[PDB]
Design a protein around this ligand. Structure first.
Ligand code: CA
Ligand code: CA
Ligand code: CA
Ligand code: CA
Ligand code: CA
Ligand code: CA
Lengths: 72, 173, 98, 49, 72, 72, 49
């Protein structure tokens, strides 16, 4: 397993030191930030808090926002 | 039933029932960093003369690193940038007996520094697995042949100076 | 109103429910907690719209799921070309390569 | 009111519900039990405007 | 087992690469798109999103639409 | 498992003799009050009641108040 | 099917027939117009007619 203090679906060590979401063939995959693969595609480096289920206290998760599974 | 026990696992890591120290925390956090690599690896390194230490002296005034060459201080880290030696915290001195010196830190809270130890561990055990009879294993060389065409693995594993030498020969077999 | 005789009737919105398939007994049951207003603002933001009036000169509106390049869930849908979008929504064909 | 014609319309508060993603079948379903008056004071105390 | 992320009842290796629905005796089957067979039967090659339960974001799944298990 | 009579998530060893809350990198930590270590960081020392889920008898627990998991 | 052979009353029935465009509907058995009258209106053949 991996530790998850807020139960949003993203590990603690990724919310603190950076992460991004990338699609590979037709499937989304949340991944830690790698400056050699992810700068080449223009992806964004996200950071949030490892102990809030939503960082800005709105009713949308940090995982729902960056993946797209959200009210459109 | 399980609701009040779904709450006690959300506070499994906050409440520390006995704390009692600050440097005893880093000792118990360096050990369980080191016992999640499997048992077969840790005897491979000691076979070649592997002495793994934990120190609290930072690696500028350590007695087994006061004397070395001006290029041994400059090897690239997990990124590829050779770092000033005053800010490094993991080193391997390997001139006749490989000694892996690890400065203790809060290693479960930190995950960037926990990866610059596993990179230096596999640096030492690399030359064993990479070669059989002082020649490169075709079990491995067929992997570098397969990973050089994909446009993602080529800039994930290989270095930038390696990317301008492999395709310069354009088939470096 | 007796002078000018001008009175119209607008339609601001429409309430109404959605009926979904029951895999248990094969029936169809109206769920009275789900209305169509939770769905139409999600169809309208993830689809392309094409209006066409080649049947009895009346406008027929159809929506087709196309890919948004700035939303990671939306980049999983298959590629939609303008020829294929006409061939499945209205019933075009190509009997001689045209 | 016929003389000065001064009449205006204040807006004291606004009710309204929230719609959340349902992870089972991907649908978005308005929960009629919670409104934005629980959420909006939590944003104005943690965020910079 | 076979990976089905979107939970709709059709595997993700089939939605990306093509599938079809065809009955043989009196039962419904859902086979991947074999080019040398299914084209001559007059069938249709479908593709859809392997991570959405409904590719058009409307309340009928990608499995219910192609099988007739729908509001008629 | 360490005793907790009032079910407020914080043990009865800590509630009587002192505790304090501090974040370390981006994660909170609840710890017993050690005098020489904690005082020079300017932290506050809390004591509460091990029998009451809320010592002031208001609807917020002692764990919710000192941590910040509370109505803002 | 509508029928009024019983003192001119438009007796109405509905018989489940196969839609050839829906893969759930093609599983229903093959229905013929001779059989459909024989089961919903009491038609019969005692000697082939
Ligand atoms: Ca998390
Ligand atoms: Ca979070
Ligand atoms: Ca699927
Ligand atoms: Ca699907
Ligand atoms: Ca307690
Ligand atoms: Ca208490």
């Amino acid at each position: 397993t991996v530790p998850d203090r807020d139960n949003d679906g993203i590990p603690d060590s990724l919310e603190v030191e950076g992460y991004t979401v990338d699609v590979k063939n037709k499937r989304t995959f949340l991944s830690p930030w790698i400056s050699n693969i992810h700068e080449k595609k223009g992806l964004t480096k996200y950071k949030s808090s490892p102990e809030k289920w939503s960082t800005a206290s709105d009713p949308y998760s940090d995982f729902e926002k960056v993946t797209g599974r959200i009210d459109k | 039933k399980t609701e009040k026990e779904k709450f006690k696992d959300s506070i499994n890591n906050l409440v520390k029932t006995e704390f009692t120290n600050e440097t005893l925390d880093k000792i118990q956090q360096t050990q369980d960093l080191l016992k999640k690599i499997p048992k077969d690896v840790l005897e491979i390194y000691s076979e070649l003369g592997g002495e793994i230490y934990f120190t609290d002296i930072d690696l500028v005034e350590h007695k087994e690193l006061q004397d070395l060459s001006e290029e041994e201080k400059n090897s690239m880290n997990s990124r590829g940038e050779k770092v000033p030696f005053a800010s490094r915290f993991v080193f391997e001195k390997k001139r006749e007996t490989p000694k892996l010196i690890i400065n203790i830190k809060d290693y479960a809270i930190n995950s960037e520094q926990s990866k610059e130890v596993y990179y230096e561990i596999g640096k030492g055990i690399s030359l064993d697995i990479i070669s059989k009879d002082k020649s490169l294993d075709p079990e491995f060389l067929n992997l570098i042949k397969s990973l050089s065409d994909d446009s993602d693995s080529s800039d994930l594993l290989f270095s930038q100076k390696f990317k301008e030498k492999l395709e310069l020969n354009n088939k470096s077999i | 109103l007796e002078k000018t005789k001008q009175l119209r009737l607008d339609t601001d919105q429409v309430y109404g429910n959605i009926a979904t398939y029951n895999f248990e007994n094969g029936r169809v049951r109206v769920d009275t907690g789900s209305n169509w207003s939770e769905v139409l603002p999600q169809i309208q933001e993830t689809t392309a719209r094409i209006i066409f009036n080649g049947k009895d000169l009346n406008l027929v509106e159809r929506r087709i799921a196309a890919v948004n390049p700035s939303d990671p869930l939306e980049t999983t849908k298959p590629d939609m070309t303008l020829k294929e979008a006409l061939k499945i929504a209205f019933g075009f064909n190509e009997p001689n390569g045209n």
